[PDB]
């Protein structure tokens, strides 16, 4: 699993040469579609997506194609003629409390992050700035802010959702997750 999922896990950040990922994202289409969290890229002047290859990190400029503000998601398209391995939206599955899930990300250096955990809730609300997002998943697989925007998968490696790391009142990290059907159903082309 830790072999076949990471290639579709990207880093996302600004366009500076010396800039690295500020969040993660998931490649969801051959021609360079990335889903990531909206609050991570909306204030960025330029967006660059960082992709792992056998020869090291490759960077591609990206633009926003569609925003899903109600669920803090953004859909990017990389500007490239290259083709990518991706999550197959057909294979998108749901999860239930108790189920085991895996949250992937890339750090500020482009290295892969994975953490395992259980689904603790399948209906939690979250406040990202002014938006009240509802019906979120909740899981302890999300321990780090660098995991925000990256994918949650099940044990078979199907895309299950997109992760949001949030702040507790005590400052403890709590894992949240936008269910992956929010992707298919707020999308068309």
Numbering used by the authors: 34 to 222
What did the authors write?
Here, we characterize a protein called MamO that helps to initiate the formation of a magnetic mineral called magnetite in cells of the magnetotactic bacterium Magentospirillum magneticum AMB-1. Although predicted to be a trypsin-like protease, we show that MamO has lost its ancestral catalytic activity and instead gained a new function as a metal-binding scaffold. Two genes in the MAI, mamE and mamO, are homologous to the HtrA proteases, a ubiquitous family of trypsin-like enzymes that functions using His-Asp-Ser catalytic triads. It appears to have lost the ability to perform serine protease activity and instead performs two noncatalytic functions: direct metal binding to promote magnetite nucleation and activation of MamE’s proteolytic activity.
To explore this possibility further, we determined the crystal structure of the protease domain. It crystallizes as a monomer with the chymotrypsin fold and the catalytic residues properly placed. Loop L1 of MamO adopts the inactive conformation seen in many HtrA proteases in which the main chain carbonyl of residue 192 (chymotrypsin numbering; W222 in MamO) prevents access to the oxyanion hole. Although glycine is highly conserved at position 193 in the trypsin family and is critical for catalysis, MamO contains a glutamate (E223) at this position. Therefore, the active configuration of MamO would contain a strong steric clash between the E223 side chain and the main chain carbonyl of W222. The active configuration is strongly disfavored unless glycine occupies position 193, indicating that the E223 side-chain in MamO likely prevents the formation of an oxyanion hole. While refining the MamO structure, we observed a peptide bound near the predicted peptide-binding groove. We suspect its source is the flexible N-terminal region from a neighboring MamO in the crystal that is not built into the model. However, the bulky side-chain of W222 in MamO seems to block the exit path between loops LA and LD, forcing the peptide away from the catalytic center. Overall, the structural features of the L1 loop appear incompatible with protease activity: E223 provides an energetic barrier to catalysis while W222 serves as a physical barrier to productive substrate binding.
